């Protein structure tokens, strides 16, 4: 039924949700795939064509949501060749009834006849719309007797069916009969063939599977299912003006309606068996090929750092070698400015390994990799290592506050003589698989020196450990979690809780002194002519 508009034709269609442009077409074009069309939501454009007749025998309605030259819903011009003697001679618009918005323009079609005969005011609604029909067809045949002067062609079957519809007062202006019994529904654009939503020729707003409706089936509804906002399973999306259950062609559902691609601040997600645009949140996913192995870069240096801006996945590994940090005079790569390392604060996943053998001495924490959540380890370093932290004598805390999974590989943390807080760390939580002979943690600042100088996990960190001092560096919280901060209370009584996480409660959850304020967050959890 539906088809986005502009040689063959995927136009065995009835409505073109767009413009119909016919340009630079020769005489030998199968324009028969258009016969079925009977609504054009944009304009119709016919220019630079050599074919003799334009078959659109079923077209009745041209909406003109978009108009050509800001004036015309139909535009027909220069459809002739002088050398060839091929030219347009007829517009087969026998059945054309209503041009909702826009005018008509037919000029400079040397062999096109009879366009001057018809009455355009019977069709165009906007009477202030411009209508130009000139300089297209002299030495033209006169019209048939049966047509009585109004025709889309020489024959007697090519007459404009100009049948006056004197609708009744009660009828708001569109009717399928003469008396007040036969008023078209209010949602009908033009007339109708009956008094229902289904009987309209064209819809004033939206078409839901034949029924002309004011709004496509909305996403949330007070369906009384809970007497509140519910997911009417019967939900539909706008393909411009036709309600569809599933966006056809190759579209995506951005909120209420179909679109050709998600907007800038959103991304595609596989949801409800459909592709939906969900808001990007922090930042849209951006993968960026990594270093080492199949990469052309053996380390990150002053040439690669700016290639990792706004990256969420690394699609590979990350290497921080002293040749990249301090520069390379045999390659003439300059040294790296430590601030640029902040580029990695957006990284949440690394497909292969992470290798750190050098780091700016002032940086006492790899907190630039705080939001790292997963190290895949599908590519590995040295003797099968997914995480390697070596020879860092100015670092004092790991700082991987958001690391939760190392999908595969071995772990090596050795010779970071000033590093603490890693002793108490349940790696069995983070590393996937048996931690058997897979940990190589040696020669960091000994436990005793760390505890003596005060370097220990915050009391609210659970036995899982921590990635540094403070409550925000814990692996797991002993009691409850106020965001990234392990928190000791939860404000439940004197703020609800779920899965040992402290959250705020929905509006209208009456604050109650000494008792539960929320029992959960929501309209259904909080503890129109109303009272």
């Amino acid at each position: 039924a539906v088809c986005p508009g502009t040689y063959k034709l995927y136009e065995r269609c009835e409505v073109v949700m767009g413009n119909l442009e016919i340009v630079l077409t020769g005489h030998n074009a199968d324009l028969s795939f258009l016969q079925w069309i009977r609504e054009v939501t944009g304009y119709v454009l016919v220019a630079m064509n050599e074919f003799s007749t334009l078959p659109l025998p079923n077209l009745r309605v041209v909406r003109g949501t978009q108009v050509y030259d800001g004036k015309f819903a139909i535009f027909v011009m220069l459809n002739y060749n002088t050398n060839s003697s091929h030219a347009l001679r007829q517009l087969r618009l026998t059945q054309l009834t209503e041009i909702l918005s826009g005018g008509v323009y037919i000029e400079k079609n040397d062999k096109l006849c009879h366009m001057d005969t018809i009455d355009w005011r019977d069709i165009v609604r906007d009477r202030d719309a411009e209508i130009v029909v000139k300089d297209n067809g002299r030495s033209c045949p006169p019209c048939h007797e049966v047509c009585k002067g109004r025709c889309w062609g020489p024959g007697s079957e090519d007459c404009q069916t100009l049948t006056k519809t004197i609708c009744a007062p009660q009828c708001n202006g569109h009717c399928f009969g003469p008396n007040p019994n036969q008023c078209c529904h209010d949602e009908c654009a033009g007339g109708c063939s009956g008094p229902q939503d289904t009987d309209c020729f064209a819809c004033r707003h939206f078409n839901d599977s034949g029924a002309c409706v004011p709004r496509c089936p909305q996403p949330l509804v007070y369906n009384k299912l809970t007497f509140q906002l519910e997911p009417n399973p019967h939900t539909k999306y706008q393909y411009g003006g036709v309600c569809v259950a599933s966006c056809p062609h190759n579209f995506v559902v951005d909120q209420t309606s179909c679109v050709r691609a998600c907007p800038p601040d959103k991304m595609e997600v596989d949801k409800n068996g459909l592709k939906m645009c969900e808001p990007c949140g922090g930042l849209c996913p951006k993968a960026c090929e990594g270093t080492g192995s199949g990469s052309r870069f053996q380390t990150v240096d002053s040439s690669n750092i700016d290639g990792f801006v706004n990256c969420t996945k690394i699609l590979g590994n990350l290497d921080f070698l002293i040749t990249g940090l301090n520069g390379d005079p045999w390659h003439k790569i300059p040294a790296l400015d430590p601030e640029k390392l902040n580029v990695f604060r957006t990284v949440r996943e690394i497909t292969g390994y992470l290798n750190i053998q050098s780091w700016p001495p002032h940086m006492h924490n790899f907190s630039v990799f705080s939001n790292l959540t997963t190290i895949g380890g599908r590519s590995l370093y040295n003797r099968g290592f997914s995480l390697l932290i070596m020879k860092n004598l100015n670092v004092t805390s790991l700082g991987f506050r958001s690391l939760k999974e190392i999908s595969a590989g071995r772990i090596y943390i050795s010779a970071n003589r000033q590093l603490c807080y890693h002793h108490s760390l349940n790696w069995t939580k983070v590393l996937r698989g048996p931690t058997e002979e897979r940990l190589d943690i040696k020669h960091n600042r000994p436990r005793r020196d760390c505890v003596a100088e005060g370097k220990v996990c915050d009391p609210l960190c659970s036995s899982g450990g921590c990635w540094g001092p403070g409550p925000g560096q814990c692996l797991s919280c002993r009691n409850y979690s106020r965001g990234g901060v392990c928190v000791t209370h939860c404000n439940f009584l004197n703020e609800f809780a779920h899965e040992a996480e402290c959250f705020s409660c929905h509006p209208e959850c009456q604050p109650m002194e000494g008792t539960a304020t929320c029992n959960g967050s929501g309209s259904d959890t909080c503890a129109k002519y109303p009272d």
Partner: antibody
Amino acid sequence: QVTLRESGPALVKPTQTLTLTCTFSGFSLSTYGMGVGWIRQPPGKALEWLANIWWNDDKYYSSSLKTRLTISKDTSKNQVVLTMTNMDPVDTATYYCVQIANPYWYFDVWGQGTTVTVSS
Amino acid sequence: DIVMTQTPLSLSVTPGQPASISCKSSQSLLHSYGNTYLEWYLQKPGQSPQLLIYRVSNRFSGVPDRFSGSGSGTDFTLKISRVEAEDVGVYYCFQGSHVPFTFGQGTKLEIKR
């Protein structure tokens, strides 16, 4: 059961004014979509649509007889009245009143028809 | 305004044989696209006319299957497949599309015993 009855004088002198009354039951001319019509048939000749009145008080008439016809309604009495002026022997006919309920058809329920003869 | 003309002015059919009656109009009975209010009525001897077909081709509630209606514009046709003894009477065509509603002159269908 929709039933309609036509009543009126069986004899009318020329140039006088005939007044017919269609009384009906089984429906009301106050419901949206209802109309009552008047159709006459001269004896042995063809039907001729005369007039139609609707729940809107909207009135439509035959053109040739527009000046002489006048149709009226009273839902409280379930009655429709027709008035024809300047009665000529040609107007001698059987006058039927009819119901129009559906917008897809006309003249579904007919009365038996009252016979009006114009003569001095 | 609209002149209606029924073509078989008289008709005599043996029971079981078909029948055809035609209504030609002076102007097209098209009010709006897909809206042609041509109706066929039957008046049996000494009765009120019954509606047989509305909108050219739609049998009214109760009309038996043998009554059919075709047509468009100014030309329409009623067809009785198997004329029965009950079908005798006068058939009228009627237009409801234009201001002066008009009937056909009538078509007397007789029975050929």
